[PDB]
Design a protein around this motif. Structure first.
Motif, PDB file in Angstrom:
ATOM      1  N   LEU A   1      30.083  -9.340  79.870  1.00 25.73           N
ATOM      2  CA  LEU A   1      30.728  -8.167  78.931  1.00 25.73           C
ATOM      3  C   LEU A   1      32.206  -8.387  78.502  1.00 25.73           C
ATOM      4  N   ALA A   2      32.942  -8.836  79.772  1.00 21.48           N
ATOM      5  CA  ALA A   2      34.278  -9.133  79.573  1.00 21.48           C
ATOM      6  C   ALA A   2      34.544 -10.330  78.731  1.00 21.48           C
ATOM      7  N   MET A   3      33.495 -11.362  78.681  1.00 22.78           N
ATOM      8  CA  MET A   3      33.759 -12.211  77.744  1.00 22.78           C
ATOM      9  C   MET A   3      33.553 -11.844  76.226  1.00 22.78           C
ATOM     10  N   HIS A   4      32.884 -10.587  76.083  1.00 23.76           N
ATOM     11  CA  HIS A   4      32.548 -10.427  74.657  1.00 23.76           C
ATOM     12  C   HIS A   4      32.991  -8.955  74.149  1.00 23.76           C
ATOM     13  N   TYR A   5      34.349  -8.767  74.558  1.00 21.73           N
ATOM     14  CA  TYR A   5      34.808  -7.311  74.510  1.00 21.73           C
ATOM     15  C   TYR A   5      36.395  -7.268  73.806  1.00 21.73           C
ATOM     16  N   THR A   6      36.483  -6.424  72.948  1.00 21.99           N
ATOM     17  CA  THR A   6      37.973  -6.210  72.436  1.00 21.99           C
ATOM     18  C   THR A   6      38.550  -5.009  72.768  1.00 21.99           C
ATOM     19  N   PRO A   7      39.255  -4.479  73.724  1.00 21.75           N
ATOM     20  CA  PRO A   7      39.644  -3.283  74.176  1.00 21.75           C
ATOM     21  C   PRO A   7      40.656  -2.657  73.459  1.00 21.75           C
ATOM     22  N   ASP A   8      40.460  -1.787  71.994  1.00 21.08           N
ATOM     23  CA  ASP A   8      41.475  -0.955  71.837  1.00 21.08           C
ATOM     24  C   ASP A   8      40.668   0.171  70.906  1.00 21.08           C
ATOM     25  N   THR A   9      41.374   1.372  70.924  1.00 14.36           N
ATOM     26  CA  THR A   9      40.774   2.411  70.158  1.00 14.36           C
ATOM     27  C   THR A   9      40.207   2.426  68.979  1.00 14.36           C
ATOM     28  N   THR A  10      41.075   1.525  68.075  1.00 12.74           N
ATOM     29  CA  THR A  10      40.732   1.060  66.823  1.00 12.74           C
ATOM     30  C   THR A  10      39.268   0.284  67.128  1.00 12.74           C
ATOM     31  N   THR A  11      39.141  -0.631  67.909  1.00 10.43           N
ATOM     32  CA  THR A  11      38.220  -1.601  67.925  1.00 10.43           C
ATOM     33  C   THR A  11      37.256  -1.403  69.020  1.00 10.43           C
ATOM     34  N   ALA A  12      37.146  -0.650  69.692  1.00  9.40           N
ATOM     35  CA  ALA A  12      36.430  -0.764  71.267  1.00  9.40           C
ATOM     36  C   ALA A  12      35.142  -0.272  70.636  1.00  9.40           C
ATOM     37  N   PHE A  13      34.313   0.491  69.978  1.00 12.32           N
ATOM     38  CA  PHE A  13      33.245   1.147  69.587  1.00 12.32           C
ATOM     39  C   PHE A  13      32.622  -0.092  68.781  1.00 12.32           C
ATOM     40  N   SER A  14      33.673  -0.431  67.581  1.00  9.59           N
ATOM     41  CA  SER A  14      33.316  -1.502  66.783  1.00  9.59           C
ATOM     42  C   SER A  14      32.860  -2.924  67.827  1.00  9.59           C
ATOM     43  N   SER A  15      33.464  -3.144  68.677  1.00  2.00           N
ATOM     44  CA  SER A  15      33.195  -4.388  69.798  1.00  2.00           C
ATOM     45  C   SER A  15      31.820  -4.315  70.506  1.00  2.00           C
ATOM     46  N   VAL A  16      31.691  -2.934  71.069  1.00  3.66           N
ATOM     47  CA  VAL A  16      30.500  -2.632  71.692  1.00  3.66           C
ATOM     48  C   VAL A  16      29.218  -2.966  70.772  1.00  3.66           C
ATOM     49  N   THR A  17      29.295  -2.494  69.692  1.00  2.00           N
ATOM     50  CA  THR A  17      28.181  -2.446  68.547  1.00  2.00           C
ATOM     51  C   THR A  17      27.962  -3.835  68.204  1.00  2.00           C
ATOM     52  N   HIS A  18      29.224  -4.382  68.388  1.00  2.00           N
ATOM     53  CA  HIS A  18      29.070  -5.999  68.025  1.00  2.00           C
ATOM     54  C   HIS A  18      28.324  -6.833  69.183  1.00  2.00           C
ATOM     55  N   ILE A  19      28.612  -6.438  70.479  1.00  3.07           N
ATOM     56  CA  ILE A  19      27.843  -6.892  71.618  1.00  3.07           C
ATOM     57  C   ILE A  19      26.434  -6.671  71.592  1.00  3.07           C
ATOM     58  N   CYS A  20      25.858  -5.350  71.179  1.00  2.00           N
ATOM     59  CA  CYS A  20      24.629  -4.967  71.270  1.00  2.00           C
ATOM     60  C   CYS A  20      23.905  -5.160  69.797  1.00  2.00           C
ATOM     61  N   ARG A  21      24.644  -5.888  68.973  1.00  2.00           N
ATOM     62  CA  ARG A  21      23.877  -6.370  67.908  1.00  2.00           C
ATOM     63  C   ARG A  21      23.745  -8.036  67.704  1.00  2.00           C
ATOM     64  N   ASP A  22      24.775  -8.664  67.784  1.00  2.00           N
ATOM     65  CA  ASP A  22      25.163  -9.996  67.237  1.00  2.00           C
ATOM     66  C   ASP A  22      25.123 -11.114  68.488  1.00  2.00           C
ATOM     67  N   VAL A  23      25.951 -10.932  69.516  1.00  5.97           N
ATOM     68  CA  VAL A  23      25.753 -11.758  70.665  1.00  5.97           C
ATOM     69  C   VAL A  23      24.436 -11.790  71.277  1.00  5.97           C
ATOM     70  N   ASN A  24      23.663 -12.615  71.177  1.00  9.83           N
ATOM     71  CA  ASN A  24      22.109 -12.535  71.609  1.00  9.83           C
ATOM     72  C   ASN A  24      22.033 -12.140  73.018  1.00  9.83           C
ATOM     73  N   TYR A  25      20.980 -11.449  73.266  1.00 11.76           N
ATOM     74  CA  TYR A  25      20.700 -10.955  74.867  1.00 11.76           C
ATOM     75  C   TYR A  25      22.073 -10.003  75.246  1.00 11.76           C
ATOM     76  N   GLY A  26      23.031  -9.845  74.374  1.00 10.90           N
ATOM     77  CA  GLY A  26      24.037  -8.969  75.173  1.00 10.90           C
ATOM     78  C   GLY A  26      23.535  -7.475  74.788  1.00 10.90           C
ATOM     79  N   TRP A  27      22.473  -7.108  74.361  1.00 14.48           N
ATOM     80  CA  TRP A  27      21.833  -5.703  74.238  1.00 14.48           C
ATOM     81  C   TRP A  27      21.487  -5.796  75.786  1.00 14.48           C
ATOM     82  N   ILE A  28      20.599  -6.647  76.286  1.00 12.80           N
ATOM     83  CA  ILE A  28      20.212  -6.428  77.625  1.00 12.80           C
ATOM     84  C   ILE A  28      21.167  -6.668  78.698  1.00 12.80           C
TER      85      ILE A  28
END
Ligand code: HEC
Ligand code: HEM
Ligand code: HEM
Ligand code: HEM
Ligand code: HEM
Ligand code: FES
Lengths: 65, 57, 75, 48, 140, 101, 98, 378, 238, 108
Positions: free
Chosen positions: H50-77
């Motif tokens: 998770l720390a390898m795929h995450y960008t922590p900012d209030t502008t970008t946080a939910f965008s990045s968590v959504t990005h993990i749960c979609r595009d980076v494969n198996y990141g949903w699990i």
């Protein structure tokens, strides 16, 4: 052009405590309409039997879809 | 039962022979079991996936 | 804590048998099922009267919620 | 001290080893192989 | 008395709960005191501590069966959400018979008590559900 | 009267459970160092019987299995052996405290 | 020297100097009909600006003085009976009182 | 002779995890220490990816968590495994705490103190990581709990301004919580080794509370295969939850972006805080409330200074076991109180249940200790 | 007020091992691009996510080419727009949430990526919301706000297309009410969970590996522990 | 007797810091073990406050470090402690290794 949704909505509520609660609703509705501008609005009944009818409709809705 | 005894005499006596045994066993059962699992998953739907209606178009 | 200076024991013979010449599950559906029923007998008298009292209070709490949020006055 | 006898494990012994008169040399490979084959199938699953 | 059995049946069943179990325990306390009163009239305990002990055992057991009956009544009515069967009180009578056999500490009495108390409880709720009058018309 | 309290005691002793693993009263005591002194000061034969009963109890709880009906140590025939020794150890504890204060 | 370094670390964890750039706000009041509370963000807190109703002015005028834990009369805080401006913050913990 | 008792790393490991003289009659509940360890290292691993795929900012946080749960494969699990792994962590943790309270293993003093330090550390880790997704529930739970920290007079207001990194919940608060949700589980792992150190020194504990130093077996290969069985049970429950109901513990308020305006009445914290969040809004006093919360877990500190009954087990006491199971029902009632809105009847039974909590602990377990200490000629 | 509790339907994907009807997802996206892609925005899906789900690659590329982009800078740096094929989100009919709030009776429309999972109830709530329009017993009725019992406060500034704008489906399925509403809610379930078929595949593989692995481990523990279950003790004093 | 000799942590502290029998001969070229340790935890500390005030993204990376240079109170000295502490750290690591290769501790 006729949906089966209105069909089963008509169809489920032939004789039921849904119809009893409709009569309860019309009783409190006559209380509301025949008393000029008080607080009570006869809405609790409306919510609870529309829940009841949508559940009995949802029991057999997916047949002809 | 001697078929398990001769299995002990062939493939369970030595250490590295036992390891190579479970290597070949895990690989073949991996292949055939993944095939069977995907077969069961398509059998339990048979009309819902994207693959069959994507090739029948 | 090392292993060997724990205590002093005399007068004890411990028999035990190998794992191989005995079986896996000796009378598993023959003794283990009265075993688990006896274990359940030893506890539920003093396990359940918390949980069912909690349960009735839960039903009564949801009951008070619905009947006190839905009021039905006289008007 | 000579009166140390074992209590009999006839409730616990395997069916090949319930016979207290037949030898346990030709009964060895099958029993050990069955236990080790259960360990092997466990190890196959864990490795998968 | 008519007041407390009327209090028991006046509850919609339904769930208005833990009043049901309180009424059932009151039924049990009354019935235990009745039968224990006949027993202490017809045994002469001597000592009197034994008389109080026997009446306490009878009242305590009848109240226990009343409580367990009411508990599984309430729970089955809430869970099944179908308050009209006698099957939920069939469960009731069998549970009451089982704990009767528990507090007398033999199991065959618990088995036969499960059977007969279940059949009587199903018939009681079922007869209330149709309507069979208490003892009479007495008209024609 | 006094008969009723003893009946409560007998009920509680049966419902306690440590008669179902064959133990006795003075074999469930929690160890401070005073308990350790009382265990050190025992006669040898009762110490050996103590460790045998404890070892059977740990065995039976290892396979989570209760003894038969017949081997339960019935009420008030168990030996109440530890209370003299532990009594005297606590007495010497009170003696140290009252002497040094 | 240790407490100088301690104060360096405490003040490094204290606040951010661009976040110290707060501001003033300028709010227009003609788009706000009766009973409408518009929440304009400022200082990182809700700014409720409400044109109340007169029926609620009856419901606030029937609020008693000396039966409350803190009597703050509505005339003793604001300028108008039907207009009110608050930091939209419950002073317990700072939620949005809806 | 043997490398397993000459090489100095393996000296410590052979006297820790191989030839460890555990007693012979361990029941099911002592697997939970190994289960907490395995949950912890799986948390560390899933959080690392998770720390390898995450960008922590209030502008970008939910965008990045959504990005993990979609595009980076198996990141949903990976995401779902981290969340439900924290859930199973706290379930296993309350089981381990309840065991240590129940079987009289709380006599081991400094082990128990190290335990309470571990408990606070896990609570802080879970809180900060739950701030991290930066959704609606995240945002308002953050603001609520930080001003709860501000309830202490004259330093606590400035202390809360200090832990903000701002005058509200800002971007700086988000990255402060990212850094601490990273760095605290390493402290938890080291203190877990300290916990295990004191436990190896003092000795383990059987179920019966009997001093069981006559019937030991070593830790291998008995409890090794028992704990591997336990780890497989963990993987079973965990994959069952992350592959059949990710919404069994998911909150519908988390999956919206953090509107700082709306604040829905669905305002409950993460669900296993609700045993203690309900107490915090039980007592209608701000400073008294936050002091009552910290005093609840301080009651869990000062548990061992009330045991005066002469047998340490509760398999061998009915009455203490009765009050302990009432305590279990009371905790579940308080969690349900936290998981319900604010009304009149819920406040009635919540006040009753919090008073019953402290009444069970500070009164009833010692009164039962006196009564069995008196009952059997002790 | 009240919360009207939504129902529970016997869905196609209700059971714990069902897939999703990809044909229903195709027509659901069709309904989305007709009517629902005017008020609500659904940023968090790209056109490449549809490439193996309910549209082929080439048809979906032309579909993405149907809609312009307003891409950013070029060689001069100011402006141009793009056809838009595959690296491409679904473009935002309302740029500002203030502009979205202004275009209706306040009340900015929610974004539709995480709706099914983020609304206290799944697609049941979206369906029954979409179908439950009815008439009040004298509520205030603030000029634009439709009464609908499947909503807290019941006041909704959304016109119902629940039969309005029948859109002439690409096959010939009857454009009734429940058909279009259920299929667009199925689409929204997909748009919330892009893993659903794959996750139940791995769930079934886990089911088989735990029904095939766990009793062997249990037997092996019982085997090695079988010494201690069978050891028997005896007392030798003098 | 003493808590230093019997407490289970403090035995490790006793065998670590108090009672290590060292040679009575070493000059300052043996300091660098503890020097590398203090450098190491100082590096951890500076980097920790850095990562409190840093956003890892190529849109925002250099802007974030610029923000540390500007708005964080003493943020410029925290960033420079991390950078030059790394440089001091590698100097001292080569000093440690040069010792261990000179004075013959590489027989271990
Ligand atoms: C403009 C008119 C539209 C169109 C064409 C659609 N919706 Fe709906 N919608 C709109 C508004 C202004 C609002 C917000 C006001 C309110 O929520 O009362 C909504 C709301 C929704 C919601 C939210 C429900 C909730 O909060 O739980 C959903 C799920 C929703 N709208 C769905 C939806 C779908 C699937 C549409 C295509 C058929 C659709 N809307 C059309 C405005 C508009
Ligand atoms: C040091 C190791 C860890 C790292 C690097 C780490 C990293 C992360 C990250 C990046 C997130 C945000 C992802 C997300 O929320 O979708 C997260 C969330 C979270 N973490 Fe951790 N974490 C670690 C350890 C832990 C531990 C030990 C726990 C406690 C058991 C924990 C509990 C949580 C919780 C509860 C969330 C919120 C889950 C959610 O809302 O989706 N984490 N962690
Ligand atoms: C950080 C989380 C924790 C972990 C990982 C942890 C880990 C462990 C482990 C591995 C054991 C040994 C298990 C065994 O021997 O069967 C153990 C034992 C113990 N722990 Fe913890 N522990 C944790 C938290 C706590 C807490 C909060 C307490 C309570 C204060 C506690 C009290 C105990 C006790 C009393 C034992 C002894 C068990 C016994 O012999 O009965 N632990 N812990
Ligand atoms: C990670 C960085 C390192 C740290 C923190 C470190 C730390 C230490 C410490 C504390 C000592 C004991 C006191 C001392 O002699 O200075 C020591 C000794 C030693 N180190 Fe390292 N060391 C590091 C890297 C290395 C490297 C790269 C080597 C070469 C392979 C090395 C080789 C030695 C040797 C040979 C000794 C024994 C010298 C003696 O005590 O006489 N160290 N180290
Ligand atoms: C785990 C502890 C550490 C953390 C959290 C950490 C954090 C960071 C961060 C956030 C940066 C980028 C900020 C910047 O430099 O402008 C950074 C850079 C750097 N770190 Fe670390 N660091 C850690 C440990 C270390 C260690 C042990 C060293 C080596 C001694 C080190 C050497 C460096 C260097 C050389 C840079 C680049 C500095 C520059 O050129 O600007 N860090 N660290
Ligand atoms: S009441 Fe607690 S914050 Fe408003």
């Amino acid at each position: 052009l006729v949906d089966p949704l209105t069909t089963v909505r008509e169809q489920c509520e032939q004789l039921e405590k849904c119809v009893k609660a409709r009569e309860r609703l019309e009783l409190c509705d006559e209380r509301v309409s025949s008393r000029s501008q008080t607080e009570e609005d006869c809405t609790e009944e409306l919510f609870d039997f529309l829940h009841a009818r949508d559940h009995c409709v949802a029991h057999k809705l997916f047949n002809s879809l | 039962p001697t078929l398990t005894a001769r299995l002990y005499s062939l493939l369970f006596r030595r250490t590295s022979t036992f390891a190579l045994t479970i290597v070949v066993g895990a690989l073949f059962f991996e292949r055939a079991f993944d095939q069977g699992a995907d077969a069961i998953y398509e059998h339990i739907n048979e009309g819902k996936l994207w693959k069959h209606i994507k090739h029948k178009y | 804590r090392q292993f060997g200076h724990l205590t002093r024991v005399r007068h004890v013979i411990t028999y035990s048998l190998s794992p191989f010449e005995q079986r896996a599950f000796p009378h598993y559906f023959s003794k283990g099922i009265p075993n688990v029923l006896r274990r359940t007998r030893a506890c539920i008298l003093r396990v359940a009267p918390p949980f069912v009292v909690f349960y009735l209070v839960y039903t009564w709490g949801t009951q008070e919620f619905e009947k006190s949020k839905r009021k039905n006055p006289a008007a | 001290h000579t009166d140390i006898k074992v209590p009999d494990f006839s409730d616990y012994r395997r069916p090949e080893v319930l016979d207290s008169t037949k030898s346990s040399k030709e009964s060895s490979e099958a029993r050990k192989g069955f236990s080790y084959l259960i360990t092997a199938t466990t190890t196959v699953g864990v490795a998968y | 008395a008519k007041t407390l059995l009327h209090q028991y049946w006046d509850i919609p069943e339904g769930t208005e709960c833990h009043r049901k179990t309180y009424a059932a325990t009151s039924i049990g306390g009354a019935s235990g005191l009745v039968v224990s009163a006949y027993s202490v009239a017809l045994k002469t305990p001597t000592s009197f501590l034994e008389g109080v002990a026997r009446t306490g055992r009878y009242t305590f057991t009848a109240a226990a069966i009343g409580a367990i009956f009411g508990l599984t009544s309430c729970i089955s009515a809430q869970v099944r959400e179908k308050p009209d069967d006698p099957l939920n009180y069939l469960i009731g009578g069998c549970a009451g018979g089982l704990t009767l056999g528990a507090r007398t500490r033999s199991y065959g009495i618990g088995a036969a008590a499960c059977a007969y108390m279940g059949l009587t409880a199903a018939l009681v709720k079922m007869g209330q559900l149709e309507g069979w009058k208490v003892f009479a018309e007495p008209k024609v | 009267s006094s008969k009723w309290l003893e009946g409560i005691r007998k009920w509680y002793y049966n419902a306690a459970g440590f008669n179902k693993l064959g133990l006795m009263r003075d074999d469930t005591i929690h160890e401070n160092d005073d308990v350790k002194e009382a265990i050190r000061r025992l006669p040898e034969n009762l110490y050996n019987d103590r460790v045998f009963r404890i070892k059977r109890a740990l065995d039976l709880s290892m396979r989570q299995q209760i003894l038969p009906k017949e081997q339960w140590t019935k009420y008030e025939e168990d030996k109440f052996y530890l209370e003299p020794y532990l009594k005297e150890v606590i007495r010497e504890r009170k003696e140290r405290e009252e002497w040094t204060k | 020297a240790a407490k100088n370094v301690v104060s360096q670390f405490v003040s490094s964890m204290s606040a951010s100097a661009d976040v110290l750039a707060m501001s003033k706000i300028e709010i227009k009041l003609s788009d706000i009909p009766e009973g409408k509370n518009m929440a304009f963000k400022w200082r990182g807190k809700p700014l409720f600006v409400r044109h109340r109703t007169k029926k609620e002015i009856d419901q606030e005028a029937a609020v008693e003085v000396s039966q409350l834990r803190d009597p703050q009369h509505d005339l003793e805080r604001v300028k108008k009976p039907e207009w009110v401006i608050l930091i939209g913050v419950c002073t317990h913990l700072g939620c949005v009182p809806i | 002779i043997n490398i397993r008792k000459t090489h100095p790393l393996m000296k410590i490991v052979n006297n820790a995890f191989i030839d460890l003289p555990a007693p012979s009659n361990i029941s099911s509940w002592w697997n939970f220490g190994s289960l907490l360890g395995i949950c912890l290292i799986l948390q560390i691993l899933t959080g690392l990816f998770l720390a390898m795929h995450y960008t922590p900012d209030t502008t970008t946080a939910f965008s990045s968590v959504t990005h993990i749960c979609r595009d980076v494969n198996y990141g949903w699990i990976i995401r779902y495994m981290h969340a439900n792994g924290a859930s199973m962590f706290f379930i296993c943790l309350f089981m381990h705490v309840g065991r240590g309270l129940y079987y009289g293993s709380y006599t081991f003093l400094e082990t128990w103190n190290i335990g309470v330090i571990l408990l606070f550390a896990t609570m802080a880790t879970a809180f900060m990581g739950y701030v991290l997704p930066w959704g609606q529930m995240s945002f308002w739970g953050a603001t609520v709990i930080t001003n709860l920290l501000s309830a202490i007079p004259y330093i606590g207001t400035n202390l809360v301004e200090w832990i903000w990194g701002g005058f509200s919940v800002d971007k700086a608060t988000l990255t402060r919580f990212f850094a601490f949700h990273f760095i605290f589980p390493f402290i938890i792992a080291a203190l877990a080794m300290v916990h295990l150190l004191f436990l190896h020194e003092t000795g383990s504990n059987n179920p019966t509370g009997i001093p069981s130093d006559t019937d030991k077996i070593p830790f291998h290969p008995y409890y090794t295969i028992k704990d591997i069985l336990g780890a497989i049970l963990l993987i079973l429950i965990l994959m069952l939850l992350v592959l059949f109901t990710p919404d069994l513990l998911g909150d519908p308020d988390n999956y919206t972006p953090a509107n700082p305006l709306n604040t829905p009445p669905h305002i409950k914290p993460e669900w296993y805080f609700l045993f203690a969040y309900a107490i915090l809004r039980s007592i209608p006093n701000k400073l008294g409330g936050v002091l009552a919360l910290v005093l609840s877990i301080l009651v869990l500190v000062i548990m061992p200074l009330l045991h005066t009954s002469k047998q340490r087990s509760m398999m061998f006491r009915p009455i203490s076991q009765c009050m302990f199971w009432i305590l279990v029902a009371d905790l579940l009632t308080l969690t349900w109180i936290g998981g319900q809105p604010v009304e009149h009847p819920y406040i009635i039974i919540g006040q009753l249940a919090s008073i019953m909590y402290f009444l069970i602990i500070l009164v009833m377990m010692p009164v039962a200790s006196i009564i069995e200490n008196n009952l059997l000629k002790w | 007020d009240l919360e009207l509790h939504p129902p529970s339907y016997p869905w196609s994907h209700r059971g714990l091992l069902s897939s999703l009807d990809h044909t229903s997802i195709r027509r659901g996206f069709q309904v989305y691009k007709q009517v629902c892609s005017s008020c609500h925005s659904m940023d968090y899906v790209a056109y490449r996510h549809l490439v193996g789900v309910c549209y082929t690659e080439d048809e979906a590329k032309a579909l993405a080419e149907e809609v312009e982009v307003q891409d950013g800078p070029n060689e001069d740096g100011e402006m141009f727009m793009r056809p838009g094929k595959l690296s491409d989100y679904f473009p935002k009919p309302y740029p500002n949430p203030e502009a979205a709030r202004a275009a209706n009776n306040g009340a900015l429309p929610p974004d539709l990526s995480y709706i099914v999972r983020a609304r206290h109830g799944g697609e049941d709530y979206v369906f029954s919301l979409l179908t439950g329009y009815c008439e009040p017993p004298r509520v205030s009725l603030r000029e634009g706000l439709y009464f609908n019992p499947y909503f807290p406060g019941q006041a909704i500034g959304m016109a119902p297309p629940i039969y309005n704008e029948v859109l002439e489906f690409d096959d010939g399925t009857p454009a009734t009410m429940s058909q279009v509403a259920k299929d667009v809610c199925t689409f929204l379930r997909w748009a919330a969970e892009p893993e659903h078929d794959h996750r139940k595949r791995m769930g079934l593989k886990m089911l088989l590996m735990m029904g095939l692995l766990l009793p062997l481990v249990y037997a092996m523990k019982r085997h090695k522990w079988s010494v201690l279950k069978s050891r028997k003790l005896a007392y030798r004093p003098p």
